[PDB]
């Protein structure tokens, strides 16, 4: 399925867990930290 | 005639500010030098004078692929 | 500023018309002769060093400056 | 046969994605073109060679010796090259007219800066990578150009060292296309560093002169009713054989305009041919 | 390689006839333009009033005076091939036959007012060409219309170009294939001074001289067709007119004792003083002898004199051993001497590479 | 494209044989254009005519005249060429470094004969003819052998450094068939170089010394004007003149054109026309002796 992508993209969502709870720290709000990349297209030519 | 095309692609894995790079070995260096001269001559001139004639007989007298 | 026992120690490479603009101007008649010797391209070639270092220090960046040709921020 | 590649500048997104917008019929030449290519080498920064910066001499032969390329592709998010040559199609030729100076159907192509007067190329000088675009002219107006360009400079040099300038400098030189006015040399002391290198020119120009229109009467009279006297004649004979080959201008692309964008307003779709 | 390019243009040196192949048109230039060009070229002699005059009489000559000059691209810029051969393919091959087929285009074109625009026509190009102005420094390579279209007061006519013009069966002519032909003063003799066998391919070349006599000068619109050089053609020009080359040379000549010393006093007895004479002294009272030449002259114009011959790439041939045939067509409100050709295309660029003499 | 054929010689050589079907680069010219041709019309006994040997002014306007080929692949069935026509592409061609020193990127190869350099002669064994393969440059020494032999020509009535570098050459000249031409070509030139400013400029002289006293700019004209200083003060030098109209006149301006007209026509004169761009592709553009390349036209 490459013939119209549109430069489509992906989103990927990632934690960042430390330790569980054994006190009051307190407890806040976790950071919902996330990456976005695009695609390449790459092809090869040559004579023959 | 025909040519043969493969329109691909490709996405990355992980970032790519996490990688380590260091030297492995260089090619010995050979290049010229000791009795070396510049192009000052054929590099044009500069500013001329009365003794240009002296200076010109100075230089054809003297005178009788690395540069410094 | 970096040195506060004395100031330089060449005075007659050190103004802006000492030597520079004088002999290796281009116009007027040995890379770097010519790079540490003009104070226009000295001047461009400092800011593009600081830049690269601020954008490294920021956030690859295209292997250039402080790679690939040796001798050029860290002069 | 192969794809051609450019990389995106980091930082540098909104300015550069909004002059892009504006400006999408930009050229783009490269001496030796290859699979992955960078900004750095195509740019002012590059042209500095034999240990000198480059002149409007130099800037000529790089473009009479580079080849002839356009592209056309205006995304926010995207930039990349595309094959030109006869072989491979070039769907969607579409280009714009940058050079806002009215022009007619059927003209030459040459690259010529007009860095002698009102030359009003903004530059982006926050990096040091610019690429400067020339205008477009006929092979008879930029010989008119020149010719003009080169009387105003002897003229003015006459002036300065005949300390008793002429009071006739212009006449009457105006240009106009079809009932028009050009609004041209409307300045005089502006000065430019561009002319450091056209003395030199001029006057070797009128040295060959002389020495061309004094050989005549040195050899024979024909008209007329431990020095061998063999280098002058030798160097002046090199150096025509030399600008024989530096006067080749001879255009190479070739303009087809279907009717006319610039009947009422220049700067529209404009169409073109690679003949 | 083939391009339809049209022109928005309604009536501007032709008539809505029935539209025929084998026509060139060319790119005229504005007055104004060249008039501004030349006047300091002119170098006086002449008088200026005469060409003032003459625009001022083709302007009102010209149909619709609010449309040229301005406007959007409406205007007198196109001139139809048959104006061109009745001007000046007259004296060229059969002028019993040329006269006729003139009167008759006269009076069945225009047959109110013809007689008047045409010498209008002839009078105005007299005085462009008597005041010694090049028009052919601004014309340039215009394309072929091809096409057979009507409407209600309109006729919008494509262009082609060089490319597989006869191998698109488009299918719109009368035969399957289009009409490829030329008229009768295409072609000049050059057997007299090229027997020799012209085994290659032809050239086409556009050749227009320039003649220079006393207060009388005329145009020559020849149509050269030769397998030599390029660099050859003036030469051949110079060759074939050399009876009237001295004559134009002696008449271009409008608008002394030498130096024989020099070989003895090359070596001996030089006098180099040409700077230390000069930086030390003022030299405002030492300029006593020097040189005097025992004459007076102001202005020596001599490239605008033997100028006199040019010739232009235009047209090619895509296979050589053309045979050309003599035959009669009958077509239109009268039947006019025709010569078909075939394998003739056009094309090319008006790259203007002269050789004077 | 068109492509013309060749008929086969008879008692076909093995040596050679071999050397074609391995070569298949080789520059040549031809006088008639034929698609048939079985002995074409390269041949040294009839370009001979009386016998004595050609000259150099000969041998050049003689490749000035005619056109130019690039020879293609041979096959054993059938010889075939390809000409030079019309600018267009023309694919399935092979060219190599004929010249012993590297050629410049974008350099248009023209035809010389043969006076670098003693070039081996091969001696076919057929009856038709025999094809010697020239070895000279297009323009580099070009331009320098011609400015010699035109040197030569009108005085009558060597060594080359670059790089390190000693190239030598063999003049040739017996023969007045091109003296006529050259003389007519000089004195033509001669007729159209003179102008009505060079008086001007001839009264200028202490104008521009003076101006070029501080300039800086006068070593690198007196260097080689021996003679011309010492024409200057034997010259009228005239006072200002009186022009006949002062607001529509500039004979600066005619002047400038017709040394454009005349540069522009001696340069066509003198140009050979040869359509020939390579663009080289991810190698360097410099050619080296020993290698293989393929054709680009543009």
């Given at each position: 399925e490459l013939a119209y992508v549109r430069d489509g993209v992906i989103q990927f969502e990632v934690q960042q867990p430390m330790i569980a709870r054994d006190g009051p720290h307190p407890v806040d709000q976790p950071v919902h930290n996330y990456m976005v990349k695009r695609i390449h297209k790459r092809s090869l030519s040559a004579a023959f | 005639n025909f040519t043969l095309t493969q329109p691909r692609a490709h996405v990355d894995l992980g970032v790519g500010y996490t990688a380590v790079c260091a030297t492995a070995a260089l090619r010995c260096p050979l290049t010229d030098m000791g009795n070396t001269a510049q192009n000052l001559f054929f590099s044009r001139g500069g500013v001329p004078m009365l003794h240009d004639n002296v200076t010109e007989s100075l230089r054809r007298i003297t005178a009788s692929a690395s540069v410094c | 500023v970096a040195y506060t026992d004395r100031a330089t120690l060449n005075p007659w490479a050190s103004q802006k018309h000492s030597y520079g603009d004088r002999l290796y101007n281009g116009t007027y008649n040995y890379s770097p002769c010519f790079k540490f010797f003009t104070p226009a391209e000295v001047n461009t070639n400092c800011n593009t060093l600081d830049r690269l270092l601020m954008e490294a220090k920021a956030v690859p960046p295209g292997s250039t400056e402080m790679t690939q040709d040796p001798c050029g921020l860290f002069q | 046969p192969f794809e051609i590649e450019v990389l995106?500048?980091?930082?540098?997104?909104?300015?550069?994605?909004?002059?892009?917008?504006?400006?999408?019929?930009?050229?783009?030449?490269?001496?030796?073109?290859?699979?992955?290519?960078?900004?750095?080498?195509?740019?002012?920064?590059?042209?500095?060679?034999?240990?000198?910066?480059?002149?409007?001499?130099?800037?000529?032969?790089?473009?009479?010796?580079?080849?002839?390329?356009?592209?056309?592709?205006?995304?926010?998010?995207?930039?990349?090259?595309?094959?030109?040559?006869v072989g491979t199609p070039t769907p969607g030729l579409f280009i714009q007219?940058?050079?806002?100076?009215?022009?007619?159907?059927?003209?030459?192509?040459?690259?010529?800066?007009?860095?002698?007067?009102?030359?009003?190329?903004?530059?982006?000088?926050?990096?040091?990578?610019?690429?400067?675009?020339?205008?477009?002219?006929?092979?008879?107006?930029?010989?008119?150009?020149?010719?003009?360009?080169?009387?105003?400079?002897?003229?003015?040099?006459?002036?300065?060292?005949?300390?008793?300038?002429?009071?006739?400098l212009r006449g009457a030189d105006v240009i106009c296309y079809n009932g028009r006015r050009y609004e041209l040399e409307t300045n005089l002391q502006h000065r430019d560093g561009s002319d450091a290198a056209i003395r030199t020119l001029v006057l070797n120009l009128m040295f060959s002169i002389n020495e061309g229109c004094l050989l005549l009467l040195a050899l024979i009279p024909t008209l007329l009713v431990r020095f061998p006297i063999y280098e002058t004649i030798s160097s002046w004979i090199s150096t025509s054989s030399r600008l024989g080959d530096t006067l080749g201008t001879r255009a190479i692309l070739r303009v087809c305009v279907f009717d006319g964008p610039s009947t009422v307003h220049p700067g529209d779709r404009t169409a073109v041919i690679q003949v | 390689t083939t391009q339809l390019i049209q022109q928005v243009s309604l009536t501007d040196f032709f008539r809505p006839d029935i539209e025929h192949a084998g026509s060139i048109v060319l790119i005229l230039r504005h007055p104004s333009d060249m008039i501004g060009e030349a006047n300091t070229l002119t170098q006086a002699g002449r008088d200026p009033d005469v060409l003032l005059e003459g625009l001022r009489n083709l302007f009102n000559a010209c149909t619709a005076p609010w449309t040229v000059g301005e406007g959007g691209g409406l205007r007198a810029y196109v001139t139809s091939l048959s104006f061109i051969a009745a001007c000046r393919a007259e004296e060229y091959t059969d002028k019993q036959a040329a006269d006729a087929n003139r009167t008759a285009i006269v009076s069945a074109y225009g047959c109110s007012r013809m007689e008047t625009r045409l010498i209008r026509f002839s009078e105005c190009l007299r005085a462009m060409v008597q005041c010694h102005v090049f028009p052919h420094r601004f014309i340039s390579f215009f394309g072929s219309l091809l096409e057979y279209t009507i409407q209600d007061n309109l006729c919008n006519i494509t262009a082609v170009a060089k490319g597989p013009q006869e191998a698109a069966r488009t299918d719109k002519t009368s035969t399957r294939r289009v009409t490829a032909n030329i008229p009768a003063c295409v072609f000049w003799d050059v057997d007299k001074d090229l027997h020799l066998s012209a085994d290659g391919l032809k050239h086409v070349f556009?050749?227009?001289?320039?003649?220079?006599?006393?207060?009388?000068?005329?145009?020559?619109?020849?149509?050269?067709?030769?397998?030599?050089?390029?660099?050859?053609?003036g030469r051949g020009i110079g060759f074939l007119l050399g009876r009237i080359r001295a004559e134009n040379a002696a008449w271009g000549?409008?608008?002394?004792?030498?130096?024989?010393?020099?070989?003895?006093?090359?070596?001996?007895?030089?006098?180099?003083?040409?700077?230390?004479?000069?930086?030390?002294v003022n030299w405002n009272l030492a300029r006593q002898r020097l040189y005097q030449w025992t004459g007076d002259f102001r202005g020596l114009p001599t490239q605008l004199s033997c100028m006199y011959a040019a010739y232009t790439l235009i047209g090619t041939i895509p296979s050589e051993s053309v045979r050309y045939t003599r035959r009669m067509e009958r077509f239109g409100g009268y039947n006019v001497p025709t010569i078909w050709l075939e394998g003739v295309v056009w094309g090319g660029t008006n790259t203007w590479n002269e050789c004077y003499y």
């Open positions: - | - | - | 995106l500048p980091g930082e540098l997104s909104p300015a550069e994605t909004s002059a892009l917008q504006k400006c999408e019929g930009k050229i783009i030449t490269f001496s030796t073109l290859r699979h992955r290519a960078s900004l750095v080498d195509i740019a002012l920064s590059s042209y500095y060679i034999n240990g000198a910066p480059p002149d409007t001499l130099s800037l000529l032969e790089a473009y009479r010796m580079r080849f002839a390329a356009v592209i056309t592709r205006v995304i926010p998010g995207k930039l990349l090259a595309h094959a030109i040559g007219n940058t050079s806002p100076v009215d022009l007619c159907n059927g003209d030459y192509i040459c690259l010529l800066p007009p860095v002698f007067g009102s030359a009003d190329s903004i530059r982006l000088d926050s990096v040091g990578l610019e690429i400067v675009f020339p205008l477009t002219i006929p092979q008879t107006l930029m010989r008119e150009i020149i010719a003009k360009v080169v009387a105003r400079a002897v003229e003015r040099t006459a002036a300065g060292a005949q300390i008793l300038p002429h009071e006739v | 556009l050749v227009f001289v320039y003649t220079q006599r006393r207060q009388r000068e005329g145009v020559r619109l020849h149509l050269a067709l030769s397998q030599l050089n390029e660099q050859c053609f000549t409008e608008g002394t004792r030498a130096l024989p010393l020099v070989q003895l006093s090359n070596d001996p007895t030089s006098p180099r003083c040409s700077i230390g004479e000069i930086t030390g």
